[PDB]
Design a protein around this ligand. Structure first.
Ligand SMILES: [Cl-]
Ligand SMILES: [Fe+3]
Ligand SMILES: [Fe+3]
Lengths: 674, 674
């Protein structure tokens, strides 16, 4: 039994199903592969097409999953899709009424066209299974829990008919207990409020990071007008007929004005975030207080996008409502994609399930063999210096103890949003200053943002308060208190409220990363590291070796440790040897608007990424001419001849566009098949 | 007592308040000026920025109205805006949460900014009055009816809180009897349905033109699942949680497939339009039978945008529920803007009302003095020949009896969507072939589109069944049956169901246009003329003399009659003397997309209009280079020298862009102040 799980929309690499298809239409595209009930490969398409939370069809993810399994497309017994057929087709039909030039291609045709054109795979209709969305979420969360019975809660933005569902789980059978309609969505509520802070889709976790800086008292009674807790685990959200946002009208009427980009986060912004987070905590704990005592289950599995609210999870852990809580590293729609495979298996035969709790999210493609990685790093020689230490982990722990900030790239990439020791940036967790600088200089993000620690399993309870239920901490699912007598010691990773979104690494969850953290603790007395995701502000978590080196070279990291190679940037790196490549969404434009006296205005030149929400940047006339000559094979230095040579100014302009990922800059060639 | 009425959004000429601001956010911008209770000027902003149903701030319209009244901005005593302040500001606030770069300027500050920058007018806060939306509609519909009291029904897309409102009007007092909530919008229902026909916003009236070709029976039972008629003049529309369209999910589930662009209208599409029209009719006649009997009133004023459903209006007239019915020529939001002026007058002190029933919509700017028209037409000499007959009307009637299609342009432009003798295209109403003739080769639009007759007051009852109530027919508000013994005689203007959207012209409503239709009747025995709006497929109704000449020269009209001048196109018109000017929304673009093997891909040159739903066209590299040098003063011929001269190929390419109005093409200078 080999089964493919699919989620996302159906757009090709270079176009979308309709022009500028909204980023909210079936996002976080991913593919997962289960064999004999075990999750053998999973990767989000964003990692391969480099568009965060992408809606595009996860063609590359399917290809990578098959390769990791050693399978051909014909080996796949079934394909599950994470929504019912009528729902996804009704939404496509809606988009087609708005875009009368678009061909009437519904999901079955589009899935089969993509697999046929993209993989040479003729999928039989009888192998395609559409699955209720919250059923897919629940299967994913519960089957990886290691529990043989549980309460399973799913809360997300929405399924086909519900924003929340409660299941009883026993053996491999799911039995629905309750649901909550779409307009009560806590995902929708959190996103509605997120837009008031100058943030958008996908930024909710940043708002969660802001909330502990605020006092929930300021806006508590305002948010209380937007919901009512009702008897027997019910609740209500109070909508409005003014605009499609539950939150902005009332807060506008009370004088709250939405933050603008580039403005600071005031105390009122912080308090708003705090009152929002408390609101969702109050609702979910109300749901669970009721269903704990009603269903009688002492164990909980929590999935759906809302289960990525780690503060909420930490409160559930401390609530005492349950003895055990489990959360999957991919509780958003990539996990529903995985759950759709289990559901598809269930509908065609018997359901085979994992035999153990999931401990590792290291499930994507790896970086390559020993030899192909060494050969590819040689291709980067004009930009990097490379050492091959006898014991890279020993050396990396020493560098960390010396205050270096490291890129850390090993093996198979993490499924789900958290970096966990395979595509990480790590630093000493003790100095508070590391938080200040890694926010400001390395990740280039807001100073309020917290940093998550990783700790060895053996030392975890010396630093963090894990009391209450037994939660799984392999995937940073839970915020927990830092023990008070350790808060000064852990300056970089203790949040303003004394908590931390902890990763507890063990020899079984992540042997190499555990050894790193253990050795560091032996050197310093503190077996704790800061662990943030390996990506700059313009990209998802890095995937390939070229991704890793590119990111190292365009962030202000000290050293890169990749598959036991020690990489440093050269004193003067020769950008001219890099070959520019368009991304499938890269566009160049020369534009004139109207000018004075109805003249044609002055020319300007821009590069942009053609997808909804894509960035854009002004370019000089010389860079515009240089980039128009890009062929995929010629180096940047040879290209720059035609505009009179790669001046330092052109190299600097190119470097800034590289940092923002408007195009691919890498040595000639590639690493080859893995 | 001089009062300015305002409706629309707040965007400048060349940008929108938020980028690509949806065409549905406060559309049909307009300005109205009342003085001592009389409407002295009104024009829609679309006529001036040449963007159909524009949302942009009606700055030009305000300027034109002030000039028509001989007023300084400072002479205005009060300004009324057609929505309450909290509602429009809440919608702007919602736009601003979606665009965190947009500065937080709300409606009061934007109104003052546009008037200060645009007119030097410093508007005191005390002079700006915001109005309930359906109240503005109701004042405008009722106060121009000539009635002493009436039942007033308003049905539109939505106001701040309702989609329908019912008033009793007496003297100048409005008393609210009932309302219907936003989700019951019949404007909303009609537009949702319209999308299924490959049409969009603003195309509803085309769907109404299609409905008689269809049989309402085939989808009657399907539409019946979407609404329920209830006691006490109540009804319900049955929504869905699938997509924001009432209509598409159910019709998709029954195998209805939305029409694609360029596809013919099938019999299914025709029957769909027929069942949709029957539905809104059934609901509104159900509202009206309950409120005619409950209120006991024999007079009805019907307003809001749904009151432009001419077929519905004819059915109301024939229902016997009322003795009198009045419909305003601008019952859409431009009329709400007018009605906001009256409400502002009632707020600040005392309200004065018009002395008589409105007979003429001729309220916009005029074409100019006879001396400046002659002078400006001489500027067009390299493209046209002009005659100055002794009696243009006499000549025009003969030319029409000879079978020519005329442009007819006189005096002040029509307020509201119907042409009525001031910006019209007129032809013989007798020949059936004139429909396909003027659709295909003049309006360049669909063939099913019926044409409307204008008839003298004296002959009206010889041709049209005006029985039932006494309706006002000066504005083409009602569809009425053509008498069966006249249907063959009126071949061009009788729909497939024997009906016609008639204009009855009188010496009182439009003297010149009356004399024209009378004379043609003396010459032919048929005092009826086909009357369609003076615009091609790419523009609103033409406004200025330059608009009139441009439209005549870019359509296939035989002759243009404009202010007693007879205009024909020269055998070989010299396009080279035309000065090209960018419109404020004109953008000229060279584009490179992504290519195979990650190269810089296809190079294209395009012109487009930068507003939501704006057209675009590919251009040749040569025209791209020529249009880039447009300075607003150099002629097309002189600009063409820089690329080798105005060749026939280039002149043809430019002409096709001119026809689509991508840029302004006109002789040097302008007509000057009117
Ligand atoms: Cl009242
Ligand atoms: Fe979900
Ligand atoms: Fe309205």
């Amino acid at each position: 039994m080999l089964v493919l799980g699919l989620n996302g929309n159906f757009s090709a690499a270079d176009t979308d199903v309709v022009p500028q298809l909204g980023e909210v239409f079936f996002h976080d595209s991913a593919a997962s592969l289960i064999r004999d009930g075990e999750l053998v490969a999973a990767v989000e398409e964003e990692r391969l097409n480099r568009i965060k939370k992408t809606t595009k069809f996860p063609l590359n993810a399917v290809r990578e999953c098959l390769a990791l399994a050693g399978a051909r497309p014909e080996d796949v017994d079934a394909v599950g899709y994470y929504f019912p057929e009528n729902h996804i087709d009704t939404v496509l039909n809606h988009l087609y009424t708005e875009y009368p030039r678009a061909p009437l291609r519904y999901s079955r045709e589009l899935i089969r066209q993509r697999l046929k054109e993209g993989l040479g795979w003729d999928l039989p209709d009888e192998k395609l299974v559409y699955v209720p969305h919250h059923e897919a979420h629940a299967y994913s969360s519960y089957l990886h829990s290691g529990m043989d019975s549980a309460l399973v809660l799913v809360l997300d933005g929405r399924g086909e008919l519900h924003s929340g569902t409660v299941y009883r789980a026993e053996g491999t059978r799911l039995e629905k207990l309750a649901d909550y309609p779409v307009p009560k969505s806590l995902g929708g509520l959190y996103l509605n409020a997120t837009y008031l802070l100058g943030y958008g889709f996908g930024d909710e976790y940043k708002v969660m990071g802001l909330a502990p800086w605020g006092n929930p008292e300021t806006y508590r009674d305002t948010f209380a007008k937007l919901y009512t807790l009702q008897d027997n685990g019910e609740y209500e959200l109070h909508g409005n007929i003014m605009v499609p946002n539950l939150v902005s009208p009332l807060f506008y009427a009370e004088g709250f004005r939405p933050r603008r980009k580039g403005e600071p986060f005031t105390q009122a912004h912080r308090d708003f975030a705090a009152a929002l987070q408390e609101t969702v905590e109050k609702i979910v704990l109300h749901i669970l207080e009721y269903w704990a005592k009603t269903s009688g289950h002492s164990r909980l599995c929590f999935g759906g996008g809302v289960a990525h609210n780690s503060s909420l999870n930490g409160l559930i852990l401390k609530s005492g409502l349950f003895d055990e809580v489990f959360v999957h590293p991919a509780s958003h729609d990539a996990g529903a994609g995985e759950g759709a495979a289990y559901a598809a298996a269930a509908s065609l035969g018997t359901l085979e399930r994992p035999g153990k709790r999931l401990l590792s999210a290291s499930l994507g493609p790896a970086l390559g063999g020993r030899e192909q990685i060494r050969a590819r790093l040689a291709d980067w020689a004009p930009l990097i210096d490379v050492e091959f230490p006898d014991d890279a982990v020993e050396t990396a722990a020493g560098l960390l103890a010396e205050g270096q900030v490291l890129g850390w790239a090993y093996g198979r990439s993490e499924f789900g949003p958290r970096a966990l020791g395979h595509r990480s940036i790590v630093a000493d967790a003790r100095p508070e200053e590391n938080r200040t600088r890694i926010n400001a200089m390395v990740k280039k993000r807001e100073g309020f943002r917290p940093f998550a620690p990783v700790v060895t399993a053996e030392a975890a309870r010396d630093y963090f308060d894990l009391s209450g239920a037994d939660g799984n901490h392999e995937f940073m699912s839970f915020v927990v208190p830092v023990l008070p007598e350790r808060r000064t010691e852990l300056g970089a990773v203790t949040h303003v409220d004394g908590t931390a979104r902890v990763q507890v690494v063990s020899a079984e969850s992540g042997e190499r990363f555990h050894r790193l953290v253990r050795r560091f603790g032996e050197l310093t007395g503190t077996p704790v590291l800061l662990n943030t995701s390996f990506n700059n502000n313009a990209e998802p978590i890095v995937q390939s070796l070229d991704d890793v080196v590119t990111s190292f070279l365009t962030t202000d990291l000290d050293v890169l440790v990749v598959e036991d190679c020690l990489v440093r940037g050269k004193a003067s790196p020769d950008l001219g040897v890099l070959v520019p490549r368009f991304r499938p969404v890269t566009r160049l434009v020369e534009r004139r608007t109207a000018g004075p006296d109805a003249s044609a205005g002055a020319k300007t030149h821009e590069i942009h990424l053609d997808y909804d929400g894509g960035p854009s940047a002004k370019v000089s006339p010389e860079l515009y001419e240089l980039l128009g000559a890009v062929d995929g094979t010629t180096t940047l230095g040879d290209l720059a001849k035609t505009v009179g040579g790669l001046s330092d100014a052109l190299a600097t302009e190119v470097f800034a566009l590289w940092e923002q990922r408007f195009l691919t800059l890498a040595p000639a060639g590639d690493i080859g098949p893995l």
